[PDB]
Design a protein around this motif. Sequence first.
Motif, mmCIF file in Angstrom:
data_model
loop_
_atom_site.group_PDB
_atom_site.id
_atom_site.type_symbol
_atom_site.label_atom_id
_atom_site.label_comp_id
_atom_site.label_asym_id
_atom_site.label_seq_id
_atom_site.Cartn_x
_atom_site.Cartn_y
_atom_site.Cartn_z
ATOM 1 N N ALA A 1 1.268 -0.973 -0.428
ATOM 2 C CA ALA A 1 -0.292 0.284 0.078
ATOM 3 C C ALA A 1 1.005 1.336 -0.053
ATOM 4 C CB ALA A 1 -0.889 -0.089 1.412
ATOM 5 N N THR A 2 0.386 2.423 -0.537
ATOM 6 C CA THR A 2 1.178 3.172 -0.453
ATOM 7 C C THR A 2 0.719 4.659 0.870
ATOM 8 O OG1 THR A 2 0.295 4.414 -2.511
ATOM 9 C CG2 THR A 2 1.773 2.946 -3.141
ATOM 10 N N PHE A 3 1.077 4.998 0.952
ATOM 11 C CA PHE A 3 1.149 6.589 2.247
ATOM 12 C C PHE A 3 1.914 7.295 1.721
ATOM 13 C CE2 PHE A 3 -1.016 3.636 5.997
ATOM 14 C CZ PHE A 3 -1.279 3.073 5.444
ATOM 15 N N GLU A 4 0.751 8.904 1.444
ATOM 16 C CA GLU A 4 1.514 9.907 1.082
ATOM 17 C C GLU A 4 1.620 10.160 2.238
ATOM 18 O OE1 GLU A 4 0.445 13.056 -1.191
ATOM 19 O OE2 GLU A 4 1.766 13.343 -2.182
ATOM 20 N N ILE A 5 2.758 11.050 2.894
ATOM 21 C CA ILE A 5 2.856 12.063 4.488
ATOM 22 C C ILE A 5 2.669 12.995 3.665
ATOM 23 C CG2 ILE A 5 3.585 11.411 6.465
ATOM 24 C CD1 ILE A 5 4.722 8.717 6.215
ATOM 25 N N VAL A 6 2.086 14.285 4.074
ATOM 26 C CA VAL A 6 2.116 15.575 3.788
ATOM 27 C C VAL A 6 2.365 15.738 5.352
ATOM 28 C CG1 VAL A 6 0.740 17.335 2.920
ATOM 29 C CG2 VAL A 6 1.165 14.389 1.920
ATOM 30 N N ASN A 7 3.414 17.210 5.168
ATOM 31 C CA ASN A 7 3.200 18.187 6.523
ATOM 32 C C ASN A 7 2.822 19.460 6.526
ATOM 33 O OD1 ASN A 7 4.179 19.085 8.605
ATOM 34 N ND2 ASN A 7 6.074 20.159 8.201
ATOM 35 N N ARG A 8 1.188 20.120 6.237
ATOM 36 C CA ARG A 8 0.627 20.729 6.396
ATOM 37 C C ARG A 8 0.976 21.551 7.267
ATOM 38 N NH1 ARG A 8 -4.694 20.108 4.111
ATOM 39 N NH2 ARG A 8 -3.274 19.163 2.835
ATOM 40 N N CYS A 9 2.205 21.061 8.300
ATOM 41 C CA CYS A 9 1.799 22.438 9.506
ATOM 42 C C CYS A 9 3.449 23.564 8.808
ATOM 43 C CB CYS A 9 2.649 21.600 10.626
ATOM 44 S SG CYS A 9 2.181 19.893 11.605
ATOM 45 N N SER A 10 2.944 24.466 10.239
ATOM 46 C CA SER A 10 3.764 25.574 9.367
ATOM 47 C C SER A 10 5.592 24.991 10.117
ATOM 48 C CB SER A 10 3.676 26.908 10.158
ATOM 49 O OG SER A 10 3.503 26.748 11.638
ATOM 50 N N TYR A 11 6.040 24.274 10.398
ATOM 51 C CA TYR A 11 6.247 23.930 11.174
ATOM 52 C C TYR A 11 7.460 22.645 10.423
ATOM 53 C CZ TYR A 11 3.664 21.398 14.481
ATOM 54 O OH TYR A 11 2.673 21.079 14.929
ATOM 55 N N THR A 12 8.712 21.832 10.159
ATOM 56 C CA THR A 12 9.351 20.818 10.329
ATOM 57 C C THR A 12 8.656 20.051 10.889
ATOM 58 O OG1 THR A 12 11.008 21.889 9.342
ATOM 59 C CG2 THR A 12 11.402 19.480 10.094
ATOM 60 N N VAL A 13 8.248 18.732 10.426
ATOM 61 C CA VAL A 13 8.714 18.124 11.874
ATOM 62 C C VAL A 13 9.081 16.578 10.937
ATOM 63 C CG1 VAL A 13 6.000 18.224 12.095
ATOM 64 C CG2 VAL A 13 6.387 16.676 10.176
ATOM 65 N N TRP A 14 9.425 15.475 11.529
ATOM 66 C CA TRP A 14 10.189 14.598 11.648
ATOM 67 C C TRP A 14 9.314 12.944 11.125
ATOM 68 C CZ3 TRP A 14 12.097 19.063 13.264
ATOM 69 C CH2 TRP A 14 13.366 19.190 12.961
ATOM 70 N N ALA A 15 8.449 12.548 10.255
ATOM 71 C CA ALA A 15 7.983 11.967 10.086
ATOM 72 C C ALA A 15 8.461 10.428 10.274
ATOM 73 C CB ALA A 15 6.995 11.755 8.797
ATOM 74 N N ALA A 16 8.001 9.314 11.322
ATOM 75 C CA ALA A 16 8.435 8.212 11.406
ATOM 76 C C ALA A 16 6.836 6.931 11.215
ATOM 77 C CB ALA A 16 8.171 7.659 13.461
ATOM 78 N N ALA A 17 7.725 5.983 10.450
ATOM 79 C CA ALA A 17 6.523 5.090 10.123
ATOM 80 C C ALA A 17 7.463 3.278 10.414
ATOM 81 C CB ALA A 17 6.141 4.776 9.308
ATOM 82 N N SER A 18 6.335 3.027 11.915
ATOM 83 C CA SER A 18 7.157 1.414 12.204
ATOM 84 C C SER A 18 5.945 0.741 12.733
ATOM 85 C CB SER A 18 7.639 2.174 13.615
ATOM 86 O OG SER A 18 8.183 0.662 14.318
ATOM 87 N N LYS A 19 6.199 -0.616 12.594
ATOM 88 C CA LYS A 19 5.240 -1.856 12.841
ATOM 89 C C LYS A 19 5.886 -2.404 13.836
ATOM 90 C CE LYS A 19 7.053 -5.573 10.080
ATOM 91 N NZ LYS A 19 7.713 -6.650 11.494
ATOM 92 N N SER A 36 5.877 16.269 0.614
ATOM 93 C CA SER A 36 5.529 14.627 0.922
ATOM 94 C C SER A 36 6.152 14.547 1.065
ATOM 95 C CB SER A 36 4.366 15.230 -0.478
ATOM 96 O OG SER A 36 3.074 16.023 -0.024
ATOM 97 N N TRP A 37 6.456 13.112 1.310
ATOM 98 C CA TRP A 37 6.945 11.739 1.283
ATOM 99 C C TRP A 37 5.528 10.522 1.286
ATOM 100 C CZ3 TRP A 37 8.468 8.942 7.032
ATOM 101 C CH2 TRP A 37 9.462 7.657 6.284
ATOM 102 N N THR A 38 6.863 9.533 -0.352
ATOM 103 C CA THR A 38 5.584 8.693 -0.492
ATOM 104 C C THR A 38 6.658 7.560 0.184
ATOM 105 O OG1 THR A 38 3.931 9.955 -1.956
ATOM 106 C CG2 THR A 38 4.793 7.440 -2.562
ATOM 107 N N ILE A 39 5.904 6.793 0.919
ATOM 108 C CA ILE A 39 6.168 5.467 1.913
ATOM 109 C C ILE A 39 5.547 4.482 0.529
ATOM 110 C CG2 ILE A 39 7.111 6.764 3.772
ATOM 111 C CD1 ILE A 39 5.240 5.506 5.432
ATOM 112 N N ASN A 40 5.608 2.989 0.739
ATOM 113 C CA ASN A 40 5.741 2.053 0.308
ATOM 114 C C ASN A 40 5.265 0.872 1.994
ATOM 115 O OD1 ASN A 40 4.457 1.843 -2.353
ATOM 116 N ND2 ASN A 40 6.275 2.686 -2.368
ATOM 117 N N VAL A 41 4.091 0.625 2.072
ATOM 118 C CA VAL A 41 4.387 -0.529 3.236
ATOM 119 C C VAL A 41 3.688 -1.299 3.054
ATOM 120 C CG1 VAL A 41 3.143 -0.606 5.525
ATOM 121 C CG2 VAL A 41 3.655 1.796 4.547
#
Length: 206
Positions: A1-19, A36-41
């Motif tokens: 599956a693809t997840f697009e992770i989008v930071n619409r915040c005005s500040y930087t975030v460090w996205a994380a994805a884990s199981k 935006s960061w597209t990941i495949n899960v």
Amino acid sequence: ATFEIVNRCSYTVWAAASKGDAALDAGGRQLNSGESWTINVEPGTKGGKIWARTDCYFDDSGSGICKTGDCGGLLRCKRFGRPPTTLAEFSLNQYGKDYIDISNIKGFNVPMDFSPTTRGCRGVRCAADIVGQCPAKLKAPGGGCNDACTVFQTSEYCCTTGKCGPTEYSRFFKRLCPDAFSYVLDKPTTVTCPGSSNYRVTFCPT
């Protein structure tokens, strides 16, 4: 599956994805405002989470610290993050269905929308100013609003015995974000989507 992770915040975030015992995709990345960061899960992934980390510092080796959601000091998370962390949770391809939810069980740091980008189910959102309204005893200095289990470590808040009820603290999160889990035995706000859906997680959706 693809997840697009989008930071619409005005500040930087460090996205994380884990199981929990492994990274999903690269496991983490810096997202400046708007990125935006597209990941495949992998299909069949059970117990995946995505979250944002705030106020991180990493060296060139990808080692450092974040004030919320730190996953053992790594940019590329293999483990889950330290509360408080608003969580997008998912189990994919479970008997032909995907299950998604947002959870405040481990507190709240960043507002989040978690929506399918394919057809056949609705998204969930927790976009209230939980940090601003956070009860004094749950405020985390680093930023964020901790859940009561993290703070107080009681059987009631942590639902250790498998019997527990809502609390003043769980009701706070539930009042602001009714569509997110507020405690372990909350009436489920899980959304069932078609197996092999794709998704977008948006930080600071509004």
